[PDB]
RNA sequence: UUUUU
């Protein structure tokens, strides 16, 4: 089997892609855990507007999926 | 500690921005940890959709449920 | 318990509850609970021609999570005692 | 959550899920991500619309706080 | 938990997103770890191995035996 | 709850998706889940006459309940709901 | 009658479930918990516009997404009788 | 995982 929290813990220090239930994404390198991400680019998947941020605390209530 | 900011506004006039393009200006007489509030001598501004119009109403006394509240600031 | 206690004091007085579906309902407050569920008696829906659905309802329960405002006349509200109760509430839970 | 010490007292971006952004010096943050800011500027569609001298933001609306 | 290991299931989330994938692990928060997951868009894209957050699931059903059918009910 | 006052009586539920369903209140709990028996929904419109859909026993999840009204049978008997027109009840938006 | 006693008493019998997204599920309720999470067996799922239909051998529905449930009248009758037997 | 969204 596989353990979810062990999986994200495998991702500390790695690039993580987080996709919310709304059609929004963030892709960056994971700092810690609501998550803190480093050098993340946020992707609006409908309007196509993308913006980058050096470091951010991203609220966990709206995240759907985590992808190493 | 964030709530200490609104603690300092007790019996003073506040601006409240609410979900649904609504705004209130009133005198904060009470609140709790959800930001349920009672505002006295309140004015409500509703913005209707560039906006098509705004509707202002006055309330002598008005309880506002905290889960619609977006932000609270000085006027 | 602060706003629940207050609402208990407005019982038997007239309030208007505006809901998150933009309906407003006027009536005599008869009950309120810890969740701020509220019971109004002899309601009349504010815009009754938009909404005749409640033409046969006199006693009405409104769920606390669907209230936007409850607004009421200042005549049955003491705002200093309310403010003092609040200061004492946030002192207690501190 | 060493992000906080690194960020408290400096300018931050709060993006609410609604899409409105607020930038200002961050006074305070709490477990539910309620914020206090010190001179908040509001941005809608990216345009400045209002400036508030201090702001409490209820954390349920915050999608993220990004560093400056 | 009212609930497939290594069998393929479909899952749908609040907000509408809907994915498929083979269940390779889970825990009691109903976190799922599913691989070769692909979400069907509102056409598909494939996300590789994703951990799904248990708080966002609405529906989990097995894929084997789920099928499109014509109207089975009375007119 | 205040809902104990409505037990075993005709009740009219307004739901968060704007629907109106009537029935005998057979039970409730602290999240406002409800059992209605012999229930039916009313679809009031502006363009077309009122529709009545039979629903039987109806368990409603409290998350979706906005209001529960007590139906006054005399007042409701006085109303000819067939020829009634009105606007759609809006959805609750949180 | 508590709503969860009725739901728990309808385990093993048909049930119709409608979710917030407007889909409905017709099936046998084999089980539920106090959150209102459900597992159903032999289900017909109908999409919101009544447009498209799927048959599911079994299914799990998280309770926080349910709008309402429809239950046979005899289940409610059986439970009322059982509660009226438990008093004496 | 239903009332502080």
Author numbering:
A (entry chain E): 4 to 36, 41 to 75
B (entry chain C): 9 to 57, 66 to 91
C (entry chain B), F (entry chain H): 1 to 94
D (entry chain F): 6 to 73
E (entry chain G): 24 to 26, 31 to 69, 79 to 111
G (entry chain D): 1 to 88
Task: Quote the authors verbatim.
Eukaryotes possess eight highly conserved Lsm (like Sm) proteins that assemble into circular, heteroheptameric complexes, bind RNA, and direct a diverse range of biological processes. Among the many essential functions of Lsm proteins, the cytoplasmic Lsm1–7 complex initiates mRNA decay, while the nuclear Lsm2–8 complex acts as a chaperone for U6 spliceosomal RNA. The Sm family includes the Sm, Lsm (“Like Sm”), and bacterial Hfq proteins. These proteins share a conserved “Sm fold” consisting of an amino-terminal alpha helix followed by five antiparallel beta strands that form small beta barrels that assemble into ring-shaped hexamers or heptamers. Here, we elucidate the molecular basis for Lsm-RNA recognition and present four high-resolution structures of Lsm complexes bound to RNAs.
We crystallized the Lsm2–8 complex bound to UUUUU-3′-OH and UUUUU > p and determined their structures by X-ray diffraction to resolutions of 1.9 and 2.3 Å, respectively. In contrast to the Lsm2–8 complex with unmodified RNA, the structure of the Lsm2–8 ring bound to UUUUU > p reveals that the last nucleotide is highly ordered. The cyclic phosphate causes the RNA chain to make a sharp turn of nearly 180°, which positions the terminal nucleobase to stack over the last histidine at the carboxyl terminus of Lsm8. The terminal uracil base adopts an unusual syn conformation and forms a hydrogen bond to the Lsm3–Asp83 side chain. Lsm3–Arg27 forms a hydrogen bond to a nonbridging oxygen on the terminal cyclic phosphate group and makes a salt bridge with the Lsm8 carboxy-terminal histidine carboxyl group. This binding mechanism is markedly different from that in the S. cerevisiae Lsm2–8 complex with a noncyclic phosphate, where the terminal uridine adopts an anti conformation and lacks direct contacts with the corresponding arginine and aspartate residues. We find that Lsm2–8 binds tightly to an RNA oligonucleotide with a 2′,3′ cyclic phosphate group, and fourfold less tightly to the unmodified RNA with a 3′ hydroxyl (Kd = 26 and 100 nM, respectively). The 2′,3′ cyclic phosphate group bends the RNA chain around and stabilizes an unusual syn conformation of the terminal uracil base. Quantum chemical calculations of 2′,3′ cyclic UMP indicate that the cyclic phosphate stabilizes the syn conformation of uridine to be significantly more favored over the anti conformation. This syn conformation of the terminal uridine facilitates stacking on the Lsm8 carboxy-terminal histidine and allows for a hydrogen bond to Lsm3 Asp83, which could not happen in an anti conformation. The carboxy-terminal histidine residue of Lsm8 that stacks with the terminal syn uracil nucleobase is also strongly conserved in almost all eukaryotes.
